[PDB]
Design an enzyme around this catalytic site. Structure first.
Site, PDB file in Angstrom:
ATOM      1  N   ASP C  37       0.836  -1.198   0.000  1.00 13.83           N
ATOM      2  CA  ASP C  37       0.000   0.000   0.000  1.00 13.83           C
ATOM      3  C   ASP C  37       0.872   1.250   0.000  1.00 13.83           C
ATOM      4  O   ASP C  37       2.094   1.158   0.010  1.00 13.83           O
ATOM      5  CB  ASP C  37      -0.954   0.010   1.202  1.00 13.83           C
ATOM      6  CG  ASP C  37      -0.230   0.044   2.538  1.00 13.83           C
ATOM      7  OD1 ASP C  37      -0.823  -0.411   3.537  1.00 13.83           O
ATOM      8  OD2 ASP C  37       0.919   0.525   2.606  1.00 13.83           O
ATOM      9  N   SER C  38       0.240   2.417   0.001  1.00 11.32           N
ATOM     10  CA  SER C  38       0.967   3.671  -0.115  1.00 11.32           C
ATOM     11  C   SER C  38       1.921   3.893   1.048  1.00 11.32           C
ATOM     12  O   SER C  38       3.104   4.243   0.825  1.00 11.32           O
ATOM     13  CB  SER C  38      -0.010   4.830  -0.197  1.00 11.32           C
ATOM     14  OG  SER C  38      -0.986   4.460  -1.122  1.00 11.32           O
TER      15      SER C  38
END
Ligand SMILES: CCCCCCCCCCCCCCCCCC(=O)OC[C@H](COP(=O)([O-])OCC(O)COP(=O)([O-])OC[C@@H](COC(=O)CCCCCCCCCCCCCCCCC)OC(=O)CCCCCCCCCCCCCCCCC)OC(=O)CCCCCCCCCCCCCCCCC
Ligand SMILES: CCCCCCCCCCCCCCCCCC(=O)OC[C@H](COP(=O)([O-])OCC[N+](C)(C)C)OC(=O)CCCCCCCCCCCCCCCCC
Ligand SMILES: CCCCCCCCCCCCCCCCCC(=O)OC[C@H](COP(=O)(O)OCCN)OC(=O)CCCCCCCCCCCCCCCCC
Ligand SMILES: CCCCCCCCCCCCO[C@@H]1O[C@H](CO)[C@@H](O[C@H]2O[C@H](CO)[C@@H](O)[C@H](O)[C@H]2O)[C@H](O)[C@H]1O
Ligand SMILES: CCCCCCCCCCCCO[C@@H]1O[C@H](CO)[C@@H](O[C@H]2O[C@H](CO)[C@@H](O)[C@H](O)[C@H]2O)[C@H](O)[C@H]1O
Ligand code: SF4
Ligand code: SF4
Ligand code: SF4
Lengths: 207, 94, 76, 115, 114, 114, 176, 154
Positions: C37-38
């Site tokens: 994820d980010s």
């Protein structure tokens, strides 16, 4: 001069009414309402964009000279679209007079910090942020002032419960003070005090 | 009050005052702890006639604010300028 | 030191345990192939700042989305 | 001997009192009790961090003034010399130069603490 | 009248030449107000009260008598107010609060009680 | 639907502020464990930071995000300057909370709360 | 009117100047200050010999609460709950029902003495002089639970202190 | 055996209760009546009761006023930093059980959630004399300690 009734002072009422329309004439860009109460207190209600121009004019203008910021507070009115009423109470030593300036904002909208006008406002705005959650833009050092470190919520909001959400105690196992969901040995007892009969006709609201 | 004359003299000289005239301990110059009963007066509204409450009701003479301007000639100030205070004639310089 | 840059970068990614070292490749996309994820990406970028010892502003950082893109950025 | 005996007794008594103080009382030791004190809240940084000295220049001048006394302390003995003409001149000379040094530091603001 | 030794207010120095200083500041205020539209109430009101203060300064050469006429405290307080007014006039040009109301409030924004 | 921004004019600007805050929180954890002498690991603290960021990942109002970042920055300042005590730092881990089962049956046994 | 607390220019004549040099060098104003504390050393101290001597109080003193009776021994409290409504601290808790003879009486009357602010509003609100604050102020306890009074405790306080309570009420009721 | 430890308790108890040093620690209103107990009329010092600022040199903590949540960790800290034996006197309604802020979101409902309490002094505030009654009650509690008698019978 009836002994039990507060006397009415009309010379001040006229003087405050005159200055009220004087302010409105000079600052039509921001002033939305001007009113004088029956105990002779002048209130200016302004658009929030005019916080700095209105307060600066009242502090510096030769016919105003409101050099002292008596108090800066907020009121929470949940029924309004902009629930937060911001209230500046100013004092003029030169003209021995007081004025109240009112604006509004909501949960997500900031207000310009008046610290550049009155350095007294620094802690007042920290208190308003801490207790109501109203953010002040370009404030030199905005942060909680009255609540505990890490406290979540803004207690002076009407929808914040009186006893809050958490409470503290010392736990011997972890050898420190811990925070836990609030339980009360005796619940606060809500009283319904309002009489079902109207008291003040003069303030009746039309249906 | 029981201090001897020599000690009265000594603490008077050291302090530079006459301490005896204004002792800080209270003796019998105070009021008696048993007093006669009072008979307190009544107020102006204790009349049997010409006393209708609606002529002496302060809460009902309160009115909502006067709207001067609502967005729905000489310059003025909020009040006359304050007068400059005058120096005391009792004791101007402490 | 271009040749060593590639080796060092992959040394960082091996340590980061969210990704399979056999799944890892110099062209594999952090979000797509690796499943990150980010925030995970932000952690990777911070690990590179510690290594090559220089700031990686966020404007630069969000572009670096594959191991290869990082080595290219380091070159400058 | 007497002096050595007297010093040993003094510091022997003091040590005995400390020993008694440490082994007589009932002890209950835990981390919070022995943590550093600072008005109820945890210390912010180490007490071993540098602590600026504002009177540093006076402190160095003390070292130079603190040696004037060694030069002046022999004066009661020097007053027994036959050559009193030379004595008094040299004794007054030292004290004046000490006074002049003090005046110089004073007039040049050396005794003012740095802000 | 002999010059004061103190204004009585901490940090407010005694002014050596009050009459000239006031004339400079009142003239500057009038100069700044010339850039505000003739219809702005700030200009008309500030010009009026400014011209009345300036007229007093030009007609009373005694600092004691002039202070009594201006009714603004010590003459150094009056100078400070003149400086504050000049600061405001420059700010008002940027703000232009003589413009029409920027926005009406919501319907019941100022209704009390609810 | 035109409102005054707090900081970020849109979500892309707001998200950059979020990542700047996350980096600051990520870098600070090792110092917090060292300074406060916490028994947790640097991994446990960093996992908690992730958990606090992850619970607000559904927001799409740039103003709501700006307030969250504002409160996050204030939250970090208290930790770095050691205004918080160990009790305040360890309140994130609810160490004295007995776990509350979240299934219907377990709730049904213990009381009436849904 | 106003006065100046510190605006005096000292005189510069050699006598006044020499007087101040003597003050600086001979410490005369510091010696003068020593005279004052010396004078106090020879004054009778104001200390009373507690608990053998007590400080003076008045009949209005607001101390420990007690529930009172009529001369017959019937309770004055009729469970009107005015005291419970006015209590600023919500320290009073009451339950009532018809007694076995039909009388309107309480079955619960609690005062949380650790909530109470000893403000005396309850005894102002009571229309029958049932609940009062008596003159006792020496009832500190070793446990928190001992300060949570129920009706039995408060009735015992009334019987315990009634002789003094009645005499104080007699001395002050004409001011009420 | 029993006779010697019996006298030894009497001695250590007498010394500890005759030399009670409260921490210089006050919180709000009630600290004003604590001052009046140190003032000439009551003169706590005449009983051997002497304020000392350092927790290390204090025997008693008098919790004199409202304890907020923000203050609670600090109060526990200085209590822990007293050497033993140590005692806590809870003074006033706020300390006793929250008092008139009992239902506040920011107040600890009684200092006995944070520290053990030996004596509870009621009042809002307790008079200076009422606090002196509590201190003398604490002294009589210490007079009854049986540390060595219990040790002897272990
Ligand atoms: C080493 C030094 C210590 C040992 C020396 C012992 C010397 C003898 C002390 C005798 C004191 C007896 C006091 C007394 O009579 O009590 C009566 C008292 C009844 O009198 P009262 O009805 O209360 O009225 C008292 C006066 O009205 C109110 O009292 P008063 O203020 O009027 O004083 C009365 C009297 C009390 O003084 C004395 O009798 C003793 C004087 C010795 C002075 C030593 C210094 O003083 C005088 O008459 C004036 C002369 C005293 C000399 C003052 C010099 C001041 C110093 C100079 C100023 C500069 C200071 C720097 O009864 C008691 O309370 C008995 C209490 C017993 C206390 C212990 C007494 C022994 C003292 C210690 C001895 C050693 C152990
Ligand atoms: C100017 C100088 C002044 C010096 C003054 C010195 C004090 C003079 C008065 C002494 C009277 C006796 C004091 C006993 C106080 C002991 C402390 C206490 O109360 O603890 C309770 C304890 C009881 O503990 P306990 O066994 O019941 O339980 C403890 C465990 N918890 C905490 C869980 C309950 O007393 C004792 O343990 C023994 C009592 C001994 C009494 C006789 C003293 C002998 C001690 C010798 C120690 C060995 C090392 C040698 C030290 C040097 C000695 C000179
Ligand atoms: C024939 C030729 C003869 C030649 C020799 C002749 C010499 C005679 C004249 C010499 C001068 C006499 C005085 C000498 C004593 C020292 C005087 C002194 O130093 O006073 C000044 C000092 C500072 O005062 P200050 O006003 O603040 O500073 C100056 C302002 N810029 O003031 C202070 O020190 C302040 C002290 C504060 C602390 C005082 C607390 C104690 C006070 C009570 C003590 C009373 C004295 C007790 C003496 C005990 C003796 C056993
Ligand atoms: C910046 C540098 C400053 C340098 C300052 C130096 C100051 C010195 C001043 C002179 C001090 C001594 O001054 C001198 O003392 C001696 C005493 O000891 C005196 O001498 C006198 O007494 C001595 C013995 O005591 C006799 O032998 C002699 O017959 C008699 O003249 C001198 O008459 C006097 O002039
Ligand atoms: C032979 C022994 C006896 C001889 C005396 C020897 C010591 C002489 C000390 C120096 C005296 C002159 O040098 C000294 O310089 C400073 C300049 O900062 C002067 O002025 C300063 O002093 C005082 C006190 O610090 C301040 O209130 C003042 O604001 C400041 O101007 C002093 O008034 C002067 O006393
Ligand atoms: S004294 Fe005041 S706070 Fe206490 S029980 Fe009576 S009304 Fe309630
Ligand atoms: S004590 Fe008095 S006020 Fe309270 S319930 Fe009884 S009768 Fe009513
Ligand atoms: S118990 Fe009463 S006097 Fe003491 S702090 Fe609380 S409100 Fe103030």
């Amino acid at each position: 001069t009836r002994p039990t009734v507060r006397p009415r002072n009309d010379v001040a009422h006229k003087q405050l009414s005159a200055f009220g329309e004087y302010v409105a004439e000079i600052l039509p860009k921001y002033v939305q309402q001007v009113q004088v109460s029956c105990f002779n207190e002048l209130e200016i209600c302004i658009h929030p964009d005019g916080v700095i121009p209105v307060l600066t004019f009242l502090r510096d203008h030769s016919n105003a000279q409101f050099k002292s910021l008596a108090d800066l507070t907020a009121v929470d009115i949940p029924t309004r679209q902009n629930r937060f009423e911001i209230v500046y109470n100013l004092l003029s030593l030169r003209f021995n007079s007081r004025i109240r300036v009112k604006t509004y904002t909501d949960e997500l909208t900031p207000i310009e910090s008046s610290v550049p006008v009155y350095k007294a406002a620094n802690w007042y705005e920290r208190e308003i942020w801490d207790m109501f959650g109203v953010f002040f833009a370009n404030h030199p050092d905005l942060r909680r002032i009255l609540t505990d470190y890490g406290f979540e919520g803004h207690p002076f909001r009407k929808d914040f419960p009186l006893s809050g959400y958490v409470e503290l105690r010392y736990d011997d196992e972890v050898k420190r003070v811990v925070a836990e969901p609030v339980e009360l040995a005796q619940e606060f007892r809500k009283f319904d005090l309002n009489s079902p009969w109207e008291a003040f006709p003069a303030y009746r609201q039309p249906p | 009050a029981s201090a001897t004359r020599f000690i009265q003299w000594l603490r008077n000289w050291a302090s530079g005052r006459d301490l005896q005239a204004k002792l800080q301990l209270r003796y019998q110059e105070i009021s008696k702890r048993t007093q006669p009963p009072p008979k307190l007066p009544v107020g102006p509204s204790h009349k049997l006639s010409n006393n209708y409450y609606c002529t002496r009701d302060g809460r009902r003479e309160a009115m909502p604010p006067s709207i001067v301007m609502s967005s729905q000639k000489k310059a003025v100030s909020p009040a006359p300028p304050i007068k400059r205070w005058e120096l005391s004639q009792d004791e101007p310089y402490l | 030191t271009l040749e060593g840059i590639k080796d060092r970068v992959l040394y960082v990614l091996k340590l980061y345990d969210k990704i399979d070292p056999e799944k890892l490749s110099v062209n594999s996309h952090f979000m797509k192939d690796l499943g990150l994820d980010s925030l995970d990406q932000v952690e990777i970028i911070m690990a590179m700042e510690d290594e090559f010892g220089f700031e990686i502003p966020d404007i630069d950082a969000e572009k670096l989305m594959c191991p290869q893109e990082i080595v290219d950025y380091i070159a400058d | 001997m007497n002096l050595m005996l007297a010093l040993l007794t003094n510091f022997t008594l003091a040590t005995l009192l400390v020993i008694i103080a440490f082994w007589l009382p009932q002890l209950n030791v835990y981390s919070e009790k022995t943590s550093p004190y600072e008005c109820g809240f945890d210390p912010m940084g180490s007490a071993r961090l540098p602590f600026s000295m504002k009177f540093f220049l006076v402190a160095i001048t003390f070292l130079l003034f603190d040696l004037e006394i060694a030069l002046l302390l022999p004066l009661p003995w020097a007053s027994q010399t036959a050559n009193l003409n030379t004595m008094l001149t040299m004794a007054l000379f030292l004290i004046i130069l000490l006074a002049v040094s003090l005046a110089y530091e004073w007039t040049q603001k050396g005794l003012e603490w740095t802000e | 009248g002999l010059l004061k030794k103190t204004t009585g207010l901490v940090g407010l120095a005694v002014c050596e030449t009050p009459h000239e200083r006031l004339k400079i500041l009142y003239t500057k205020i009038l100069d700044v107000l010339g850039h505000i539209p003739k219809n702005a109430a700030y200009r008309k009101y500030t010009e009026q009260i400014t011209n009345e203060k300036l007229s007093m300064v030009k007609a009373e050469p005694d600092v004691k008598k002039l202070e009594e006429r201006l009714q603004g405290g010590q003459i150094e307080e009056v100078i400070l107010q003149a400086e504050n007014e000049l600061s405001l006039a420059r700010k008002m040009i940027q703000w232009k609060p003589w413009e029409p109301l920027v926005e009406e409030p919501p319907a019941s924004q100022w209704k009390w009680p609810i | 639907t035109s409102v005054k921004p707090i900081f970020s004019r849109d979500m892309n600007e707001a998200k950059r502020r979020v990542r700047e805050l996350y980096r600051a929180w990520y870098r600070e954890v090792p110092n917090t464990v060292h300074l406060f002498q916490l028994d947790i690991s640097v991994k446990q603290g960093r996992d908690k930071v992730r958990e606090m960021f992850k619970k607000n990942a559904h927001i799409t109002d740039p103003r709501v995000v700006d307030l969250l970042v504002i409160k996050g920055k204030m939250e970090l300042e208290e930790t770095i300057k050691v205004w918080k005590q160990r009790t305040h730092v360890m309140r994130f881990f609810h160490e004295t909370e007995a776990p509350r089962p979240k299934d219907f049956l377990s709730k049904f046994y213990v009381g009436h709360d849904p | 009117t106003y006065k100046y607390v510190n605006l005096r220019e000292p005189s510069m004549d050699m006598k006044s100047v020499t007087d101040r040099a003597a003050q600086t060098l001979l410490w005369t104003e510091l010696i003068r200050g020593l005279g004052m504390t010396l004078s106090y050393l020879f004054r009778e101290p104001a200390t009373i010999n507690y608990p053998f001597e007590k400080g003076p109080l008045s009949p209005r003193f607001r101390g420990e609460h007690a529930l009172r009776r009529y001369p017959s021994g019937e309770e004055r409290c009729i469970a009107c709950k005015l005291c419970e409504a006015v209590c600023p601290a919500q320290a009073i808790t009451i339950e009532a029902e018809p007694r076995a003879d039909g009388s309107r009486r309480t079955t619960r009357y609690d005062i949380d003495m650790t909530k109470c602010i000893y403000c005396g509003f309850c005894q102002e609100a009571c229309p029958v002089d049932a609940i009062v604050e008596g003159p006792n102020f020496e009832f500190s306890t070793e446990t928190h639970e001992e300060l949570l009074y129920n009706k039995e405790k408060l009735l015992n306080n009334g019987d315990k202190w009634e002789a003094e309570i009645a005499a104080n009420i007699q001395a002050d009721y004409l001011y009420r | 055996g029993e006779y010697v430890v019996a006298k030894l308790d009497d001695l250590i108890n007498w010394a500890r209760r005759s030399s009670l040093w409260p921490m210089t620690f006050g919180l709000a209103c009630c600290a004003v009546e604590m001052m009046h107990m140190a003032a000439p009329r009551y003169d706590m010092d005449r009983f051997g009761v002497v304020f000392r600022a350092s927790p290390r040199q204090s025997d008693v903590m008098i919790v004199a006023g409202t304890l907020t949540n923000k203050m609670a960790p600090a109060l526990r800290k200085v209590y822990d930093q007293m050497p033993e034996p140590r005692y806590v006197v809870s003074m006033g309604s706020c300390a006793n059980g929250g008092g008139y802020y009992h239902y506040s979101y920011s107040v600890v409902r009684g200092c006995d959630r944070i520290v053990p309490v030996d004596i509870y002094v009621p009042g809002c505030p307790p008079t200076a004399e009422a606090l002196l009654y509590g201190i003398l009650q604490l002294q009589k509690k210490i007079k009854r300690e049986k540390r060595l008698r219990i040790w002897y019978r272990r």
